């Protein structure tokens, strides 16, 4: 049984969804029982999103294998159902430094180096290496960029080998491009699409799928007149309109036939998707019981793009709309008003002194006020921070990450007993949680992994009074490779509602389909405080 | 002083108002003091557009001289005020087709023909004879169609040729591209111009000026990044924006500087603009002092493109906004409520029967309830079949054209007598008015001309008979070359406010600097009508 | 049984041989009993060759329907061995004349007409009447031009669109490219082949089939190494190298596996063709068993393409080589000399003045010194002029053609009384050979079809004279349509080893299957002279 190749590639515009394109094609593989992986190649030079910042510009993505990767791996991730790694994440960067480092090395055994074949035998190289350690039976490949742009030719190229390598039936192109509508004229524009496809035609590749993303659906008769130009035929011409929910889309696109389409074209004896997960999930979005509202406290208000699907994935298992307010950390300055029909307080991650002491006063605020509070990673330094300065009267609390002279640094660097040198604690820690907490009754477990992206950790020297002030370590982690070692990973406190905080990010490995129990408690609280 | 030639291209999509910018530029540049012309390049394969429909899929224009084009002419001739000819409307129907003649008449002496050059000369030889013609001293030629189709290049590599035809400082080429803007990203899509003009450039032409169509302003940031890809120095890259008034674009481009920047590439010295008139009408289409509603009985309700402009002209003189009610001929069946809130009654042109029945019942009320009413061509024999009918007691009466058979043909083809064969009056044809009338009041003058098309006249026999019923021609035409010699141009009713029909289609040269009379006079019978 | 499709298309440059190469791979499927038909599209605009001119810029073949064409279907005619018709060569011009004449009758209904879909509707449905017409089974059709120009873009377009409208396996694409050879570098460059077949992918042709043109054939490695790039199966890269002798090429191309794979693509049973012909014809070429020497005595020394192919292939069946000794027509001026080792003396066909005296004094020259003679159309009037002169003893004697004053205009137009008006006897006309004669003896018939292009005849108020003179009217024609009736079609000498001259071009229906017996005679009594 040969391995499948379906490669995902853009026209006309940058921005067509093309990444959740790619993972709601994913979905209706794994639906009908294939193991599949998607990569994503980004024609950019970075190596990879690690020096890049982490909110900012657009969320960067962990995996579990601490890699740092662009925020589709997310997606793909969420649709798919399960962890990716480093090696699902191609840029040009890894691809010029590993041929021209193995050059260096002499390795190409004093041949002239070229883009091709050797940069392009890169690539092929590492979209088979990544796929046969996932045992895919099916590969879903989107090329980043957008046809007709020099950083993704030489990706372009490589995947066009992949027909002749991979023999006849194996492989299989997708094309989405922009199909400008005209309200008034009430007209779709397919020349851009045309000119698109001629140009991919020019550099060697014939898509024999199309996508065609508008406003609104693509007419069968446009459809046709697309089909006939294209050299695609009618039946494998499929429309990308806009809709409210993005859960919808793996739904409208099987519906059309994308699906049956793409079994077909790789020749696979066709398979009823079971899609009954979708379906539900996006009838509780359409129609949610009920409805609360927390604000989401941040510096940075896709910067959150994991944490707003967690939020999404919890809101669904309790059959709830969540609205989120967003607050301005830095503003907090009438919290009554700022949080005025709010049930439920979130601060996320962030890096930098600014709007610390404003997260502070949300924390404080919501822990006095009997309001359900989640803090991840910062969002929990910032609580240990404020119950540090009003709970233990600890003065001048404070992370050495913003004041580097506070007389208590009840958050600072990796312990110098435990480490093992200046990296940040990356991809997944396991966690051990403590029976009793509000923490054991989310997970039910007492072991679990969560991925970590932080350098600064609660200070071991000031738990035991923390403690004693009332402070409850309801997690802890057993390290890794020797480092980390009784490092606290989560606190909350007993005299409330809902006030938790964990030092991973949880929403990183909420899925739709499996939503992070953190997030699900504090959806939860959140409604009942709403009562 | 050497002849200059802006040649104006389109990218990416077909329909970007590339008509209109074109207009708009020829009349910065008459605004400037300059003898201009337009040519409309049509690269559709019909010889004219006298074989289309004449308003079904949008109007026909009618030229001084007769000829049948598309309705382009007409936005130049109103941008222009200029009478434009056959010549001003390009196709290649006609360029194919002479250059086959004359091959076949072996006058191209036994040499193999071919696009280039024989093609290709043709084209260059039709834009410089009507040039010549008119004795432009700037010539603005558009090309229609869309860079990057096949239709256009044959015209695209004749128009290439003239930079080296005619001397550097005397062709300029200015390419219109779509820049879709993403509402939500609120983002400005560059990347359809870049690959548009990187074609243009494949074909061997290099825009000089850019101007990027988009639902709002093109920022400066972002008209800087496009210059620097596209090889356009910054200050020749403009914005088009969406504009409620069409008269905007000829103001909003001047004031970015298209006007400075042509005559400045062209090698001209700098001549202050006088658009006075422009602002002016600009400033009544935004703040009238009244504003009235008139009907439209039409069979097709751009049809009627021409006479809307018309109505828009004449408002603007009478200082009033006119909004038109639409209301479909064949429909016509409560006309209390039809014509509910209307103090205006227009009966447009058209052929076959269908809606005749019902503009004829839209006649017959406008005539009886006393509400102003305006005939054009079909709408002047329209009144005089219901006048005919319902006034001179002539049963049945009704035109050849809808029933061959009626025992009273009051509207007939040419009469064989006045005939020199089945050829319709077509341009202008000189129109005697006759003192004391309502179309005299209007003119003010006796002797005009007007532009014709259609194949049916007032029968000369019954005229008599509806003149004693009470009926005024008060417009006849002497004819034209011994042909329709006394023909009936123009009737009226003495006892009402204002009941005027005519034979030819007045709207065609109707100019926002200069209102049709009897479009001045409707919209201000109107007005006095709404009390 | 579904009709079958290959095109043919070339890329780089204009000369590569096409022509011939279509006419191979048209051999080698009647090799395989198949019902073949070629179509050349010349994308010039000229209707026809009818314009240009018959000799000097390179011959026009004429086929049986009287149709004036280009010289490649001459080349279709001989290794198809079958009579082609005007439906055979399609234009431009003839293209675009008929839609534009049909739109101007307003056939196409009123909407507005294109190159697409219309000018390619046309295109795609002469080549389906004309090979409906013919029952072809296979139809080859050669794109004139170069692919990336804009002249053929219309036709490229055209036939693309076939393999939809014919359904799969039903159409074939085979595209031929120069790869230029260094002889010092000894490397073959294969880039030019790389662009041009990128940019055929541009307008939407991928083609299943490649012909690498070069100096040599192009080794297995290199001609992999281009089948990878252009998506073009390995086994699916052809040579064609340059040769001796044309028969050659289609049994290089069959060695090397193109019929085999033409088979096959188009999803036929494998024929094992029968190309004994071909493989004899070239083993008589390389090994002739004799060779002799005969001087064309013409004004144009590819004006006679087809004329020398038909000495080929006389020269095959005499098993003789023919050596060709150019006499330039206007400089005979001692005949001795040269004629000096000439067998033969061949006075072809050709309008104007020039050179009709020297062909004259050659002759003569062949009459008195007994040396074997072959008029063809202008080589008969000639003969005749000459016998009048010099044996009528009508001095002066001449065509009205060079002379419109002689007093004996014993060549002249077609007789008032045999007219029904002023257009040449063009393509197949009955010749009722007589018996007894050298004509009869060469053909062994009595009746025969020959084609003819010329506008002057034999007069018949000297054929009497002459004859009594001594020259025998070998043949006449009955006419044909009511014209023409007892025309003289050939004339001969009794006491000569060979002098015979014919108003038809016999050249025309030579195929190196079935050679023209005027020829065959003609090299055998050559052979004769040679002793
Ligand atoms: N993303 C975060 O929440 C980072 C928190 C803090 N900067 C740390 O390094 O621990
Ligand atoms: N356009 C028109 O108004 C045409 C009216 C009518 N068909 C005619 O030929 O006179
Ligand atoms: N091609 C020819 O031989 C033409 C001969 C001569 N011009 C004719 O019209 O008969």
């Given at each position: 049984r040969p391995r499948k190749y379906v490669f995902i590639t853009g026209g006309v515009v940058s921005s067509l969804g093309k990444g959740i394109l790619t993972s709601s094609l994913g979905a209706l593989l794994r639906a009908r029982g294939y193991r599949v992986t998607a990569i994503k190649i980004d024609p950019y030079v970075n190596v990879d999103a690690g020096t890049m910042r982490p909110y900012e510009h657009g969320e960067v993505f962990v995996t579990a294998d601490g890699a740092e990767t662009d925020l589709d791996i997310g997606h793909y991730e969420r649709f798919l159902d399960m962890d990716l790694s480093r090696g699902n994440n191609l840029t040009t960067g890894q691809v010029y430094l590993s041929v021209?480092?193995?050059?260096?090395?002499?390795?190409?055994?004093?041949?002239?180096?070229?883009?091709?074949?050797?940069?392009?035998?890169?690539?092929?190289?590492?979209?088979?290496?990544?796929?046969?350690e996932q045992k895919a039976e099916i590969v879903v490949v989107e090329v980043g960029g957008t046809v007709g742009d020099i950083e993704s030719l030489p990706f372009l190229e490589a995947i066009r080998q992949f027909r002749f390598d991979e023999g006849e039936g194996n492989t299989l192109y997708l094309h989405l491009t922009l199909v400008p509508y005209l309200e008034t004229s009430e007209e779709f524009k397919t020349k851009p699409t045309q000119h698109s496809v001629a140009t991919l035609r020019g550099v060697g590749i014939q898509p024999d799928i199309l996508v065609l993303r508008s406003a609104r659906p693509v007419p069968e008769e446009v459809r046709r007149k697309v089909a006939l130009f294209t050299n695609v035929r009618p039946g494998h011409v499929f429309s990308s309109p806009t809709v409210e929910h993005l859960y919808e889309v793996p739904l409208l696109l099987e519906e059309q036939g994308l699906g049956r389409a793409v079994e077909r074209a790789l020749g696979l004896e066709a398979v009823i998707p079971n899609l009954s997960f979708w379906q539900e999930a996006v009838r509780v979005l359409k129609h949610p019981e009920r409805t609360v509202k927390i604000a989401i406290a941040g510096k940075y208000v896709?910067?959150?793009?994991?944490?707003?699907?967690?939020?999404?994935?919890?809101?669904?298992?309790?059959?709830?709309?969540?609205?989120?307010?967003?607050?301005?950390?830095?503003?907090?300055a009438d919290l009554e008003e700022a949080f005025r029909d709010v049930s439920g307080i979130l601060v996320p991650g962030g890096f930098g002194v600014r709007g610390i002491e404003g997260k502070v006063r949300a924390a404080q605020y919501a822990?006095?006020?009997?309001?359900?509070?989640?803090?991840?990673?910062?969002?929990?330094?910032?609580?240990?921070?404020?119950?540090?300065?009003?709970?233990?009267?600890?003065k001048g609390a404070n992370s050495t990450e913003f004041d580097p002279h506070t007389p208590h640094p009840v958050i600072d660097l990796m312990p110098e007993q435990l480490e093992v040198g200046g990296t940040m604690?990356?991809?997944?820690?396991?966690?051990?949680?403590?029976?009793?907490?509000?923490?054991?009754?989310?997970?039910?477990?007492?072991?679990?992994?969560?991925?970590?992206?932080?350098?600064?950790?609660?200070?071991?020297?000031?738990v035991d009074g923390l403690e004693r002030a009332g402070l409850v370590v309801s997690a802890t982690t057993p390290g890794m490779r020797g480092r980390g070692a009784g490092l606290v990973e989560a606190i909350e406190l007993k005299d409330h509602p809902f006030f938790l905080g964990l030092q991973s990010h949880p929403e990183f490995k909420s899925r739709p389909m499996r939503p992070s129990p953190p997030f699900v408690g504090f959806v939860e609280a959140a409604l009942a405080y709403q009562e």
């Amino acid at each position: 049984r040969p391995r499948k190749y379906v490669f995902i590639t853009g026209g006309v515009v940058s921005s067509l969804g093309k990444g959740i394109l790619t993972s709601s094609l994913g979905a209706l593989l794994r639906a009908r029982g294939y193991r599949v992986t998607a990569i994503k190649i980004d024609p950019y030079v970075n190596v990879d999103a690690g020096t890049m910042r982490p909110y900012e510009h657009g969320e960067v993505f962990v995996t579990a294998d601490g890699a740092e990767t662009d925020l589709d791996i997310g997606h793909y991730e969420r649709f798919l159902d399960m962890d990716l790694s480093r090696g699902n994440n191609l840029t040009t960067g890894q691809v010029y430094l590993s041929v021209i480092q193995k050059e260096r090395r002499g390795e190409y055994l004093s041949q002239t180096v070229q883009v091709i074949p050797h940069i392009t035998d890169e690539i092929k190289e590492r979209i088979r290496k990544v796929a046969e350690e996932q045992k895919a039976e099916i590969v879903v490949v989107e090329v980043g960029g957008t046809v007709g742009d020099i950083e993704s030719l030489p990706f372009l190229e490589a995947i066009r080998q992949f027909r002749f390598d991979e023999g006849e039936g194996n492989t299989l192109y997708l094309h989405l491009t922009l199909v400008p509508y005209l309200e008034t004229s009430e007209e779709f524009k397919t020349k851009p699409t045309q000119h698109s496809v001629a140009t991919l035609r020019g550099v060697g590749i014939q898509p024999d799928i199309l996508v065609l993303r508008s406003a609104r659906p693509v007419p069968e008769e446009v459809r046709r007149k697309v089909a006939l130009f294209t050299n695609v035929r009618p039946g494998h011409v499929f429309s990308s309109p806009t809709v409210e929910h993005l859960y919808e889309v793996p739904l409208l696109l099987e519906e059309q036939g994308l699906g049956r389409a793409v079994e077909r074209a790789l020749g696979l004896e066709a398979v009823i998707p079971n899609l009954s997960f979708w379906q539900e999930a996006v009838r509780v979005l359409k129609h949610p019981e009920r409805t609360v509202k927390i604000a989401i406290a941040g510096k940075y208000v896709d910067a959150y793009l994991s944490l707003l699907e967690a939020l999404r994935h919890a809101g669904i298992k309790n059959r709830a709309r969540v609205e989120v307010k967003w607050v301005d950390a830095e503003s907090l300055a009438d919290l009554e008003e700022a949080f005025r029909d709010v049930s439920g307080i979130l601060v996320p991650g962030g890096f930098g002194v600014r709007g610390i002491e404003g997260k502070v006063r949300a924390a404080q605020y919501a822990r006095e006020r009997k309001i359900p509070y989640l803090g991840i990673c910062l969002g929990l330094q910032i609580a240990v921070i404020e119950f540090a300065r009003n709970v233990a009267g600890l003065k001048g609390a404070n992370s050495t990450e913003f004041d580097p002279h506070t007389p208590h640094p009840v958050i600072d660097l990796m312990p110098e007993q435990l480490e093992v040198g200046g990296t940040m604690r990356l991809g997944d820690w396991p966690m051990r949680i403590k029976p009793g907490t509000l923490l054991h009754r989310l997970y039910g477990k007492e072991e679990v992994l969560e991925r970590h992206r932080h350098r600064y950790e609660v200070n071991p020297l000031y738990v035991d009074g923390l403690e004693r002030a009332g402070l409850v370590v309801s997690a802890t982690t057993p390290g890794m490779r020797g480092r980390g070692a009784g490092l606290v990973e989560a606190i909350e406190l007993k005299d409330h509602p809902f006030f938790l905080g964990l030092q991973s990010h949880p929403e990183f490995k909420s899925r739709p389909m499996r939503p992070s129990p953190p997030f699900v408690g504090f959806v939860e609280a959140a409604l009942a405080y709403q009562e």
